[PDB]
Amino acid sequence: NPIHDRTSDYHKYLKVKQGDSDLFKLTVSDKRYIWYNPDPKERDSYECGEIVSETSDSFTFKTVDGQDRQVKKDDANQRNPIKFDGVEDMSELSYLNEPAVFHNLRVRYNQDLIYTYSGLFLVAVNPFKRIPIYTQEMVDIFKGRRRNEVAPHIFAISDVAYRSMLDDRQNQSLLITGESGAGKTENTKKVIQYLASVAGRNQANGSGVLEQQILQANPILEAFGNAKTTRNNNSSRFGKFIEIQFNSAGFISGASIQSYLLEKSRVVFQSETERNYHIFYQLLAGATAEEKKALHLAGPESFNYLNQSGCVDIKGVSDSEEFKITRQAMDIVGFSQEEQMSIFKIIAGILHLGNIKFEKGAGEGAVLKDKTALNAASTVFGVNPSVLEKALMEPRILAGRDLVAQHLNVEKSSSSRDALVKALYGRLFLWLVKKINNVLCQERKAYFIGVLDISGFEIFKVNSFEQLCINYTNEKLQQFFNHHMFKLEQEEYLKEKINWTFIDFGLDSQATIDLIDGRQPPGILALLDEQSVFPNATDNTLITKLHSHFSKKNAKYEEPRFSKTEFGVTHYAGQVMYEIQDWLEKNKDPLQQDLELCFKDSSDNVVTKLFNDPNIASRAKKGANFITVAAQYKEQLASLMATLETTNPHFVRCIIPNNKQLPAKLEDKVVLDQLRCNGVLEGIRITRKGFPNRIIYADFVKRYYLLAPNVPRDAEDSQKATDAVLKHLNIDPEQYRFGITKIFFRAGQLARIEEAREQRLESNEPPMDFDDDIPF
Numbered sequence: 001n002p003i004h005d006r007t008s009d010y011h012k013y014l015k016v017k018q019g020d021s022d023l024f025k026l027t028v029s030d031k032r033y034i035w036y037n038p039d040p041k042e043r044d045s046y047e048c049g050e051i052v053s054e055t056s057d058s059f060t061f062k063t064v065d066g067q068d069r070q071v072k073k074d075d076a077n078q079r080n081p082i083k084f085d086g087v088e089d090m091s092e093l094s095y096l097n098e099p100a101v102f103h104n105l106r107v108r109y110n111q112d113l114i115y116t117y118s119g120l121f122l123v124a125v126n127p128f129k130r131i132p133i134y135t136q137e138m139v140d141i142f143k144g145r146r147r148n149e150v151a152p153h154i155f156a157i158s159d160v161a162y163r164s165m166l167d168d169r170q171n172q173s174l175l176i177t178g179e180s181g182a183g184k185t186e187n188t189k190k191v192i193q194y195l196a197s198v199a200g201r202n203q204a205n206g207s208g209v210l211e212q213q214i215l216q217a218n219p220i221l222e223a224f225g226n227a228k229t230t231r232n233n234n235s236s237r238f239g240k241f242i243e244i245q246f247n248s249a250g251f252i253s254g255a256s257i258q259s260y261l262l263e264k265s266r267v268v269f270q271s272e273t274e275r276n277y278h279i280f281y282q283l284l285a286g287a288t289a290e291e292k293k294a295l296h297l298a299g300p301e302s303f304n305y306l307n308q309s310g311c312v313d314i315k316g317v318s319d320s321e322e323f324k325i326t327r328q329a330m331d332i333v334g335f336s337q338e339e340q341m342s343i344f345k346i347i348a349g350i351l352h353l354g355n356i357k358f359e360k361g362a363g364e365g366a367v368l369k370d371k372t373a374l375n376a377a378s379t380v381f382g383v384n385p386s387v388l389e390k391a392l393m394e395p396r397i398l399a400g401r402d403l404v405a406q407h408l409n410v411e412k413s414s415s416s417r418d419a420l421v422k423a424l425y426g427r428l429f430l431w432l433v434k435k436i437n438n439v440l441c442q443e444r445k446a447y448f449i450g451v452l453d454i455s456g457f458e459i460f461k462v463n464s465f466e467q468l469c470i471n472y473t474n475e476k477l478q479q480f481f482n483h484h485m486f487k488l489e490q491e492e493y494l495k496e497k498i499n500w501t502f503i504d505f506g507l508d509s510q511a512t513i514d515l516i517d518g519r520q521p522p523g524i525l526a527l528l529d530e531q532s533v534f535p536n537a538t539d540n541t542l543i544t545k546l547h548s549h550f551s552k553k554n555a556k557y558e559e560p561r562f563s564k565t566e567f568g569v570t571h572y573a574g575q576v577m578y579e580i581q582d583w584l585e586k587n588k589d590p591l592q593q594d595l596e597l598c599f600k601d602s603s604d605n606v607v608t609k610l611f612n613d614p615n616i617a618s619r620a621k622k623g624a625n626f627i628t629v630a631a632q633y634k635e636q637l638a639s640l641m642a643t644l645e646t647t648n649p650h651f652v653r654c655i656i657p658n659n660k661q662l663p664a665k666l667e668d669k670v671v672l673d674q675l676r677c678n679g680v681l682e683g684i685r686i687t688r689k690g691f692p693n694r695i696i697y698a699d700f701v702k703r704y705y706l707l708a709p710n711v712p713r714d715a716e717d718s719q720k721a722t723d724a725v726l727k728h729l730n731i732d733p734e735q736y737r738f739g740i741t742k743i744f745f746r747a748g749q750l751a752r753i754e755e756a757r758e759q760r761l762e763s764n765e766p767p768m769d770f771d772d773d774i775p776f
């Protein structure tokens with residue numbers, strides 16, 4: 001067994017290295033140490049000092065240099081006995097404080113051990129380097145193992161979820177949190193892998209093929225939906241809820257993906273040093289010359305949407321090599337060889353349209369002198385060039401009931417062309433997602449395990465509407481954790497009347513969540529929508545309204561003194577200053593009907609669908625206007641949170657080590673912030689200070705029954721049989737507390753008492769054998 005062979009890759013890569021004699025001499029030392037601050041100014045930079053002397057309320061230690069300071073014992077950050085350094089579960093630490101909890105993560109991380117448990121939830125500090133812990137071999141190890149039996153691993157919590165789904169017959173979900181570039185997506189993938197191989201049919205195409213498809217899906221989505229931002233080379237610019245469905249038996253019956261809030265302004269604009277979506281870069285430098293000549297493609301720097309950020313390559317990635325993998329996945333899912341081409345015709349077309357140059361006519365209406373790009377785009381799109389032209393600069397609109405044709409100036413024509421682009425892409429993602437889900441969804445599920453993988457919290461120099469929506473979400477998920485961890489939990493202890501003194505773990509971002517989506521009184525997204533429907537409304541009228549409502553009124557809000565177009569929101573992960581520029585047209589999402597009228601008329605069977613399929617081209621109507629971006633997302637989100645609330649949640653807090661995407665560089669001010677706002681320690685204090693073990697006296701007969709002399713799975717009070725089954729074994733009763741519909745146990749006490757009789761081969765079935773028919 002690899003688990004026990006201290007030679008296996010399992011031991012080499014998942015277990016902490018055996019120490020040496022010097023270490024032992026140290027581990028048994030009688031000395032006591034303190035975690036202190038060499039420089040008060042910098043709280044998060046700690047040094048280990050030896051406690052030299054003490055008094056009733058204070059410790060006195062010597063610093064690294066040699067000077068001695070004291071500190072009242074209450075404000076002392078005691079260092080845990082070094083036999084703890086490396087603990088796979090910080091729930092066990094004797095002293096639970098920031099430097100102590102950070103030192104364990106340092107120790108383990110310096111050993112390439114990225115996983116550690118902080119109670120019921122797992123932790124994952126980005127390695128920023130590959131580690132052989134996700135092989136089929138490591139998959140097999142974890143399958144069917146109790147969490148205690150094995151080391152912390154994304155595969156463990158997955159399995160744990162699985163058993164719980166099968167056992168309680170309750171749907172489950174894996175919520176992976178983290179800021180931008182912390183591992184969420186990487187860990188997301190492992191959950192599927194493990195879940196696909198462990199609960200899959202061993203390949204009967206349908207179930208070994210259905211699984212290959214499920215697996216081949218993500219690369220597709222990551223090709224058109226991910227990109228290089230200044231915080232991650234593979235940033236997920238759209239969230240998603242992946243659902244893995246199981247039949248009543250417990251085998252993978254199917255899966256379905258639900259995309260969310262895709263940053264579609266990226267196709268037309270990328271900040272300095274970033275990249276458009278990979279998809280463009282792959283097809284461009286990865287397509288056959290024959291294909292290269294059919295879409296009139298050329299060098300990335302030739303296309304306006306790709307040559308502006310000053311970055312066309314990603315250190316370590318081969319767009320051509322990646323382009324292949326993409327086509328490889330499209331085939332596994334089911335995409336036709338025809339469909340795929342359109343996909344690229346549409347992408348080539350999105351590039352050409354962006355090259356289109358509008359110029360001032362003799363008058364103020366813009367003109368197109370060069371038709372080269374206009375026709376290239378129209379050509380591969382199956383549309384009519386002159387129709388497109390007229391649609392771009394002279395869109396017909398209604399004046400009351402009149403039909404007036406507009407004549408956009410350069411500025412307005414450009415923006416229209418961009419609206420076309422973005423609209424084109426957004427539909428395609430949707431479609432690609434839509435198309436895909438029909439392959440993977442072909443049987444009514446019995447149960448499912450949801451895997452939420454969103455865009456993490458981000459703070460760029462210019463933060464717009466997308467960034468507000470993104471952080472709004474990251475704030476919503478965070479509260480989902482708080483609620484479940486402290487709110488629901490404590491609320492459970494209160495009525496049981498278990499005599500639980502309420503604790504306020506100081507974690508609650510309701511004020512911030514309210515300032516954004518609240519309706520009455522109106523939060524930010526409310527006034528925004530309201531401004532979005534008023535005729536003579538402008539960005540200025542908007543920030544002013546926001547200011548008007550919240551400046552010097554709301555605590556999570558701030559009106560800057562250095563700007564008249566930015567407003568600051570205080571998030572759990574930090575304050576974020578938002579530029580209000582373009583929020584109106586962004587929230588309205590405009591597109592000229594003539595353009596939409598121009599594409600429905602497309603010869604290409606893929607494009608046509610984008611503008612004709614109602615669930616692709618349509619848009620809800622909110623009375624006299626269409627539904628706003630801010631309104632549907634709030635709606636989509638609320639729907640998810642509704643879906644989430646109906647499951648049993650498993651948390652995984654991913655932690656970025658530094659801000660340089662570098663391995664072996666765990667910066668401590670960075671890590672500590674994350675652990676702080678994430679509420680990790682608080683997440684640990686609650687499991688320690690609480691009784692998380694709980695079962696009614698009915699299910700008490702499930703495992704604790706014959707414990708004792710006489711006292712079976714049957715009785716007419718099981719509350720009578722309670723204090724008799726453990727009392728006989730005299731289990732500390734100060735460990736549990738019998739409040740009243742069921743009974744609680746403290747800190748995995750159910751476990752020690754479990755193995756008391758669990759790993760009991762003494763009478764477990766080796767009494768039959770003593771005076772058998774061995775008597776004559």
Ligand SMILES: Oc1c(Br)cc(Br)cc1-c1[nH]c(Br)c(Br)c1Br
Pocket residue numbers: 262264419420422423424426427430589590591615616617618619
């Ligand atoms: O981009 C547009 C536009 Br300009 C107009 C409509 Br009507 C729909 C889309 C679209 N965008 C995303 Br994103 C999705 Br999903 C869809 Br449908």
Ligand SMILES: [Mg+2]
Pocket residue numbers: 184185235236453454455456
């Ligand atoms: Mg991600």
